[PDB]
Every structure is written in C-alpha cells, then in structure tokens.
Amino acid sequence: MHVKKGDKVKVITGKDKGKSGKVLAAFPKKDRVLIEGINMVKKHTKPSNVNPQGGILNVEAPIHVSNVMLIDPKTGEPTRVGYEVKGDKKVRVAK
Amino acid sequence: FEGGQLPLFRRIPKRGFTNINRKEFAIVNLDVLNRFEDGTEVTPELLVETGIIRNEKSGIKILSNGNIEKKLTVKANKFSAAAKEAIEAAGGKTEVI
RNA sequence: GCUGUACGUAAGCGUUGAUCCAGAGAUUUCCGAAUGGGGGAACCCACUAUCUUUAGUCGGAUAGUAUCCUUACGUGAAUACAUAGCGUGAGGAAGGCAGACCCAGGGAACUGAAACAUCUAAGUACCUGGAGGAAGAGAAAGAAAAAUCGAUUUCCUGAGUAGCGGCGAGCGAAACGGAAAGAGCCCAAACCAAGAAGCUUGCUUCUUGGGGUUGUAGGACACUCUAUACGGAGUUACAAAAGAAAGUUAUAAAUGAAGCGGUCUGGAAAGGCCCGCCAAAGACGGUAACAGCCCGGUAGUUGAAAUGGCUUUCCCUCCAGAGUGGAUCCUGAGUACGGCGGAACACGUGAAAUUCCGUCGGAAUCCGGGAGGACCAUCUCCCAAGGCUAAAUACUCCCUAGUGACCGAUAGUGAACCAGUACCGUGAGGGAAAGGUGAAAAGCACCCCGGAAGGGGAGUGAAACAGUUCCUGAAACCGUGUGCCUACAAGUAGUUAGAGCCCGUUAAUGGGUGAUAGCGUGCCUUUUGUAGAAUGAACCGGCGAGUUACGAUUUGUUGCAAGGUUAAG
RNA sequence: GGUAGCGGAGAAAUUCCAAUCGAACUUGGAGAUAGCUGGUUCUCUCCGAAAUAGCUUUAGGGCUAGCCUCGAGGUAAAGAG
RNA sequence: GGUUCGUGGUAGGAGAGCGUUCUAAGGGCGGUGAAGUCAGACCGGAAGGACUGGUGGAGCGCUUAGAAGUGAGAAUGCCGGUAUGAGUAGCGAAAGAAGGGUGAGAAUCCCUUCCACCGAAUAUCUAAGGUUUCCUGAGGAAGGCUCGUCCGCUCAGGGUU
RNA sequence: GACUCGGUGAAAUUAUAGUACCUGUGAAGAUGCAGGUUACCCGCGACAGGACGGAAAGACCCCGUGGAGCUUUACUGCAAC
Ligand SMILES: [K+]
Ligand SMILES: [K+]
Ligand SMILES: [K+]
Ligand SMILES: [K+]
Ligand SMILES: [K+]
Ligand SMILES: [K+]
Ligand SMILES: [K+]
Ligand SMILES: [Mg+2]
Ligand SMILES: [Mg+2]
Ligand SMILES: [Mg+2]
Ligand SMILES: [Mg+2]
Ligand SMILES: [Mg+2]
Ligand SMILES: [Mg+2]
Ligand SMILES: [Mg+2]
Ligand SMILES: [Mg+2]
Ligand SMILES: [Mg+2]
Ligand SMILES: [Mg+2]
Ligand SMILES: [Mg+2]
Ligand SMILES: [Mg+2]
Ligand SMILES: [Mg+2]
Ligand SMILES: [Mg+2]
Ligand SMILES: [Mg+2]
Ligand SMILES: [Mg+2]
Ligand SMILES: [Mg+2]
Ligand SMILES: [Mg+2]
Ligand SMILES: [Mg+2]
Ligand SMILES: [Mg+2]
Ligand SMILES: [Mg+2]
Ligand SMILES: [Mg+2]
Ligand SMILES: [Mg+2]
Ligand SMILES: [Mg+2]
Ligand SMILES: [Mg+2]
Ligand SMILES: [Mg+2]
Ligand SMILES: [Mg+2]
Ligand SMILES: [Mg+2]
C-alpha cells in the first residue's frame, strides 16, 4: 500500500472530499484505510461487556486507498509518491 | 431400391474388362497450331511450355478437327491420317516420336 | 502490520525487521504394493540384537526380520563324487495412474443386407498384458519397367480408381508424382589370440579380446601403403559413465510517464461542458457510476542467493583405413519353401502371388538364393531366415501465458455454493437440488404490543416495498376493497344489435359494465369422416425437434474464359 | 460358511437366486433397431393435389409413372369448346 | 402510374418479410434514470413496433451487412411452482378420571389417589444390530399425524474404570 | 367408523364450464346440436343410472419380412464322444 499507518492524508473522492486526516489503521487484505474524521458513521450498539451503556456511536469507518492521497509533512500539501534508495534503505519520495 | 422389385442393374448384364496396358493420349487439334509462325518446329515440350498441354498421358495425338493455314514441321507420338494429310498439304512435315 | 475460511472475545508477536512470497533442507503418525506374522483398512501379536527402568517381574527406546528373480559364497540328501534343497550377502522387481494416445494376446452381438446363414457391424466395444513420452515402422532378399529411383514414417493427390463381393448390401488400395522431416549403424560367421573343459585321445567345443559385416557382390586370406592419437567421434542409434566453467531460461521480485484541473448533475464522478498532459505505457481489473493521467499495474529497462533444465567450451572416454589380387574359406537350417488347416494383406480359395500362426515333411548355400500377382523361360532389381536407430506423426491428467461472431446459474463440467456430496442401493453402482443485502455492516441504539416469533415508530443508509434466499420480482395461485350486472333461469360462455348505469382516453366515429334479442357443438392429433361418447394436455413458467462435417447434383451470383483452379506445404 | 447367471439350487411348480426370473442386477457396445405410434415452435402473398396403374416375402411400406409447384425453353400455335 | 383477368384452400411447391442471441463498422441515449417488469383507449396489411407513466437502478438501442443453440400450446413431454377435490379421507388395534402444581398458555407435562391392561408377558436379563439415542441443565423454530410447559427433537456440558 | 364440535390435514383426478329431461339428428349410443318440456339461488346427509367414469398406450383379435422360451427325422453349425 502506498499509504501507511501514521501518515497524513488528503481525500480525493467521496463525500468527505477535500478533507484530511491521519491514518489510524490499514487493511491491505482489502485495500482499505481507517482515517480520522473521515467516513464517520453511526453504529447502533446494544450494551455489552464493553460499551455497556450502549448507544448510537459516531466512529470512523474504512475508505478505499485509491480515494486517498499522501501529504508531505514538510510542505503540508498533497504529493503523488515514488520510491528511491537512500544509501541502502528504500524510502518514499514526493513528486 | 424399388420395393423388393429387382433393381435395374440386377436385371441387366455386366460387360467388359478394363485393360491394364491401356494407352490414352492427349488430344491435340489443328486449330491450336495456327498460333505459330510458319517454318518452325512443334514438339511435345513446346506444347507443354505453351500450356496447351499439361498431361502427356501416354503420348500425344494430333487430330484433324479443324484446319491449319500455316506451314509447319510437327513431331509427336501418333498422328491421324487426315491431320498428317493436312499438315503435308500446307507444306508441313511430320515425324513420329 | 500479523496470529487463515471466519465473525467473536481472550492472549500475544512484530522496523534488534514479523505475517507473507520463492528455492533448498529437516520432520513426515497409521493404513495402503504394505513387505516381521496375522487381519473384518487405517487394528492386533511378535522375534532377534544393543541399551535403559524397576528390588525384580511388568515395562521402554533404537536397528533388522516378506515373496520371487538373477548373482556370488557357504552348507547339504537319498547316493559314492555331485546336484536338489537350505542359509547368508549384493543388486532388481512387485503397485498406482490420464476413463487419453500404441504394441501384442483374446475377441462379441445389436445392427445392415429392407428375412437371413456367407458377408457386414469389426478386428470396433470389452478383458488382459507390456510399455514409452511417444509407440510402432525402418536402412531394400524393395518399388518398378526400352528409365530408372535409392531407409522408414505422416500429409496432399492417385481415388471412391484398380479391384474384392449371396459380384448382393457394401469393403476399397498401392505405386508413380508433390511436400514435411531427414541418418545412418551393429552383430553372426569364416580368420587370429588366450583360458577352461573333453583327452572328440594330437583333433574338438565352450567363454572372452581382435577381425568383419555385403550384391557392379562383400569379407576372411595374400600382399602394399597409411595409422597408435597426427586427426576424428561421443552418451539421441553408431561404447559407456562422470565432472567443471560460462551464457540463457523457469521457479520470488524491482523501477515505471502524465490532471487531487475547474464547473453541472448527483448518495457518490470514473460521466456531461471547458481546459491541459503522457504515451516503446489507450492490456486488464478495481475504486461509492463508464478512469491512459486514483490504485494495482501494463509498455520499457533491470534483477535471482538457491535449485532445476537447455546451449556452448573444456575435461573425461574411445577410436586402423584405402588399394590390388582373388589358391581356397565364410556370408543367419529343422529356416526358406511345400502339403493340410486357418488368418492378415482392399483381395470372402478365388487363377491367388506376398506376410503370419499350428502341424506334417523338408532345400541350395555364390556356376548359389529371392521378387517382379498362378506358373515356365529370358531380362531386370535385390541378398532373406539376426539386432539397433532420432526427426517429421498421435494424445493431454498437468504447468505458464493467452484467445473465442462459446454458456451465462433448467445454460455451461454431474458439481459457479464444502458434489461424486446428500440421498437410493447388500453391493457393483446410480446421483441431485442449491448463486446475487449494501459502496461500506454503517446489520435497525431507544420506545410500544407480545412469553417468543413477528410487527409499528425512531434511526442508519441514496434507498429497508434493500433488513441476514437480502438486485430485479412475470404468470399460475391466494385474498382485501370497490364501479356495473345477477336469485323464472339452463346453453363451448363469446360475438353482433343494445338500453340503462358509471368513468374520462396515446381523442377517437372513446373506455368498463352489461337487462334483453339474434347466431353459435373448444384446441390439437389422426381420420372417408371427429363438438366428438376416439387421442393428448390440471394450470403457469422455463427447457424441449431438419443440424454440422465431407461428397454428388441443380439454381442464382461473382471472377477468369478454351481455359479455369491449386491441395499438402 | 459354500454353490453365481452360456450359470447355480430345485421331495420338480417355469419354483427360487435381495419386493426383478421361460433366463437376475448393474455398467458399457448404445443415441441398438423400430416400414410403428406420438410430437415438430413466427407471419403474409401466389399456385395447389392425391387416395390411381404397374411391380414388389408385397398389401397401413416402397419405387416408377399419373396428378402439384418453380424456373428456362422452342415454334409449320401444337391446347380447350 | 394505368387497362384486363383474378384474390376459399389441406398435403405440398415458390416468394417476400417480422422478431430473438451474437459479431464488425458507423452513428447514438443512458443516474436529469439503461435493460427488464406493470398498465394503458397509439401505430403498421401480418408476424410485430413506438409513446407516456409507475417500479427498477446499470447498461442498451438504431442503421447496413454477416453467423445462428432462432420463435412452442400439446410429445400419458422434462424440472420447478400453485391449484382442484377440500377443510375432505385420515390422525395407525387398547380405560381413563379428578384434584393439586408448574406455566404467558394445559385433555395432552409433573405429583397424588381411585380405576383399568399384560403377567411363559405388555415382566427381568442378554446376543446380533443401531451407535450416543444414556444423565444433567436450558429450550419449543422445525420433527412428534392433535397439543405441548414434554420427548428417542434441538443446543451446551458430562457420562462407559 | 360414518354424523356434529375443536385441532391437524393428504390423494387419485382435472380442456375451460353458468354442467336438466323426452324425442330426434349427428363418426350411426348427446349435460353441451335441433325442437319441445320442465326448472328461483346456495348447500348438507345418503344412493350410485350416466358422464361410453378413474386406474392400467387391450393381456382377447389382427398386424410387424418384431422378440424370447421350448421341441423335432426344418436348415446351417458347435462342443463332446
Ligand atoms: K523405437
Ligand atoms: K479500463
Ligand atoms: K492367398
Ligand atoms: K526388386
Ligand atoms: K436390487
Ligand atoms: K421502464
Ligand atoms: K353413478
Ligand atoms: Mg420378391
Ligand atoms: Mg437385417
Ligand atoms: Mg449504479
Ligand atoms: Mg515365394
Ligand atoms: Mg493354405
Ligand atoms: Mg479378410
Ligand atoms: Mg506351413
Ligand atoms: Mg509377371
Ligand atoms: Mg436467475
Ligand atoms: Mg447446473
Ligand atoms: Mg427479493
Ligand atoms: Mg330476475
Ligand atoms: Mg362430454
Ligand atoms: Mg387426458
Ligand atoms: Mg407447460
Ligand atoms: Mg407348465
Ligand atoms: Mg452399435
Ligand atoms: Mg433410442
Ligand atoms: Mg386458387
Ligand atoms: Mg390463397
Ligand atoms: Mg430451439
Ligand atoms: Mg366429498
Ligand atoms: Mg373422519
Ligand atoms: Mg398365555
Ligand atoms: Mg432421555
Ligand atoms: Mg405439533
Ligand atoms: Mg362424509
Ligand atoms: Mg395399445
């Protein structure tokens, strides 16, 4: 995946287009990313051993990786990515 | 089949035999031989080269169907009497190969 | 980031580099050829050796122990040497499949002939055995003919010809010719040498080495010349078994251009409109809808530690070949042929050549022998009774990449789903049905009826008349409600005339209903003839019957025209 | 436990051999063959029969002819009344 | 475009077409809503084709050619579904009753008492066979020919020395 | 058992059906055609004259150049002797 946990991210398509957020989780078995503030969704949760109060909960859902673009933490603006070798360590490069 | 009625072929007789040394000869007429300028020589090889003939079956035979207008020397395997006559009458000549 | 499908909770590992991918290794219970003996499958019981535990029994590890064949060795009977037999060791096999392709053994009938027996179907199906990646065949005892060709195989033609045939039905070549592919070799024997066995007793007769292999005859044998690794050949035949190196390829991967362009619709933009861009990359797929420029990627360029294969190089291994003579000698014997009986050759005993099997007989062997469709002579071509041999050909359980005027869930494999399953059967064996929430579980918190199921709200979502057989949701079928008619009337149930009542249309001499009046015995099939008391259909839905290959003939069209056209390749 | 289908067993009936027996069941040849019955799916336009002869191991089949259709021909126009 | 003669039709011949699936090319509509489906009083000489609206919610027509798994109402057709009879036959040999209790709910379950049945059995053991059907605790969807609070049913744990 | 109540709940069959009688006609034996005669609508329990009723592609009969089984001094064969 071209996007990794801990990255800062812009959203290309979707209802949450134009927004940005961090990557809280990744699922390469499905090519989905779990991002803060994006695709927030209302779960109707009966009480259980945890969430024992229960309720309607706003929490983030996964959105596809192709709908998402990385941001250079130095510029703060969105950058399509390539790969280079620094010394003997592959890295990610903006362009 | 005719309903158990005896078929036509079973009510008539067989006839003949096929010869094994049969000789069938490529049949050339006179009309073709007008294509050549007089005084020249005609041959089997020439007649094949010109595409008049493809198969020298067992030989060539020249038949007097039609007419020549032109003096020619011809050579082939068998001629008909009349074609020999016509070739000579035009001043031609004949060889038997 | 991970601890599968597969949610879940619990507990945990990972940039001191996990999960994952590839290569090589290790481990690999028990059964099964199953092999230590047995056995009713996946179970049982052992022996011999070494070690181990126990106070010692009991118990535990590890190794070996099947049968047959060949080969050595040692023991060993009647029987006296000996052989049989027995034992040990070194090898080898055993069994399975791809329901395919081929070689042999054995070998049907239904059917067709409009019966039927010769014949056909058919050397098919099937059984069995052998195999191999191909097999089989194969380097002329050939094909042929006034002229020669030069191993086999496969294809086009020849040709549905020649012919076979109750001359019936039907069976049906071959060679020439043209192409693919190409390749040639080895023994046996005379003759030399050694060894052993007979003393075949001065001769054989067996095991190895050399020698030599063929038709104008060749060879052995005589000589000349060369030859001893000069040079050549090779595990695909020509002898066999190994080793390295280099390169290439396959089995993981890497890098990889260009728009978050604006605006409109919208739940969402990949779509519309206007601007740009990349392209050795506009393959495919995915992404909230149709994306070359979002993602994976593609083109292109790179790369493999390890293993495997192939191609070259080296090593290694192993290698007498021309000539002239022709005293003599050799050249595949219980075969070659013949008789009898059968079969295969297209060829059914036919005039029946050729090849093979069984049984009788039974040659010459170089002034020799075979074939040329009975046979004889002449001529021509050729040397059998011994063996090997790639390539072209056939097939596909499989792997990789891909294609389809192929299916799209009653189709397509029986099987798109845990299907050879469930289920049936004692068994062999038969054999199904069954796909779709949503972009994302966001899978309906909370309230009310109710014991639950199920509902009604609320809420999520674009949508729940998308709510866990969940996209769409036809018809039969079941019902609720209602506009018109109907309880003096029979009627293949409608049609035509038609009032009254009720609606208002794809607006046109409209719709629905129909008191009453006239006329009127379904559909199909088969029949001289059917409302038919002849047949078929409960209904609805789906599926379900003149097609394809090759050939003949004819019509039309097109192209060339006494010419036309190529097949394989 | 044995006898297995060209077979076996039968105090014998054509009895029995897994609800099957004048020759089991299953699988294959096999889409046997069927001059027999049944069925064969859309439309319109033009023309439109036959149920006869003869032969047939033939009679509810077939073949040829007669009868239909389509096309092209040819004229000393031959057809019909 | 005219004149003349015609225009019933089975087997059957001949012709012209409608429509379905796919392909190629051209050119198009389609989330501002495709195919499909539902309803209609429109169109054409026929097979058939449009338009409008609803439902659906992503693909589909038109044109000219081509190729076909090409159009069903019957095959005692094949598979699936639903009817009809029809609330019908049947509910599978037999003696139950009441009271208490449990429970949302009781002819049907549990308890008690009377009653009745078998008793060379309708008892007690145990082979073969079946293979968890045994016990306990929950449960009532389906199964049980009714019912069910129960079971040889479903779940989960145990049980064979 | 049947009958009524309550529960549960099939089947064979079935072209659609608003399914009278006499006489006649008719593929010669009509619920359905004609002509007349009867007949208000819907059911329940009972009977079985008809629907040439259902089941079972008549087993009688005939046909098929169909089959099987059996017999023999039918034909041709085979084993066995
Ligand atoms: K070979
Ligand atoms: K694409
Ligand atoms: K012969
Ligand atoms: K020869
Ligand atoms: K059976
Ligand atoms: K629509
Ligand atoms: K009756
Ligand atoms: Mg006759
Ligand atoms: Mg026959
Ligand atoms: Mg969509
Ligand atoms: Mg001979
Ligand atoms: Mg003989
Ligand atoms: Mg023969
Ligand atoms: Mg002999
Ligand atoms: Mg001769
Ligand atoms: Mg479907
Ligand atoms: Mg299927
Ligand atoms: Mg649905
Ligand atoms: Mg009235
Ligand atoms: Mg009737
Ligand atoms: Mg019927
Ligand atoms: Mg139907
Ligand atoms: Mg008797
Ligand atoms: Mg057959
Ligand atoms: Mg059949
Ligand atoms: Mg007419
Ligand atoms: Mg007409
Ligand atoms: Mg069809
Ligand atoms: Mg009744
Ligand atoms: Mg009753
Ligand atoms: Mg007693
Ligand atoms: Mg119990
Ligand atoms: Mg019940
Ligand atoms: Mg009754
Ligand atoms: Mg009958």
Describe the structure in your own words:
This is part of a larger assembly, with chains A (95 residues) and B (97 residues). Chain A contains no helices and nine strands. Chain A is elongated. Chain A is mainly β and 95 residues long. Chain B has 97 residues and is an alpha/beta fold. Chain B has a single domain, classed as Ribosomal Protein L15, Chain: K, domain 2. Chain B is built from two helices and six strands; from the N terminus they run ββαβββαβ. Chain B has helices at residues 44-49, 81-89; strands at residues 26-28, 41-42, 60-62, 73-76, 78-79, 93-96. Chain B has a three-stranded parallel β-sheet with strand order 1-3-5. The chains are: A mainly beta (95), B alpha/beta (97). The chains hardly touch. Chain A binds four RNA strands through residues 1-2, 4-5, 10-15, 17-18, 25-28, 31-32, 39, 41-47, 49, 54-57, 59, 61-69, 78, 80, 82-83, 90. Chain A: InterPro entries: KOW, Rib_uL2_dom2, Ribosomal_uL24, Ribosomal_uL24_CS, Ribosomal_uL24_KOW, Translation_prot_SH3-like_sf. Chain A: Pfam families: KOW, ribosomal_L24. Chain A: Part of the 50S ribosomal subunit.
Percent range of helical residues of chain B: 10-25%
End-to-end distance of chain A? 17 Å
Q: Could you state the order of secondary-structure elements of chain A as H and E?
A: EEEEEEEEE
Number of helices of chain B: 2
Helix fraction of chain A by DSSP (H/I, runs of at least 4): under 10%
Assembly context of the chains: part of a larger assembly
Tell me the strand percentage band of chain A: over 45%
Gap between N and C termini of chain B, in Å?
A: 52 Å
Shape of chain B: elongated
Spatial extent as radius of gyration of chain B: 20 Å
Please describe the biggest sheet of chain B, giving its number of strands, its sense, and whether it closes into a barrel: 3 strands, parallel
Annotated CATH topology of chain B: Ribosomal Protein L15, Chain: K, domain 2
Q: What's the total count of β strands of chain B?
A: 6
CATH architecture of chain B: Ribosomal Protein L15, Chain: K, domain 2
- Described by the principal axes of the CA atoms, the overall outline of chain A is elongated
List each distinct ligand once.
potassium ion, magnesium ion
PDB class: ribosome
Keywords: Antibiotic resistance element, abcf, antibiotic resistance, ATPase, protein synthesis, ribosome
Entry title: VgaL, an antibiotic resistance ABCF, in complex with 70S ribosome from Listeria monocytogenes
Chain A: 50S ribosomal protein L24
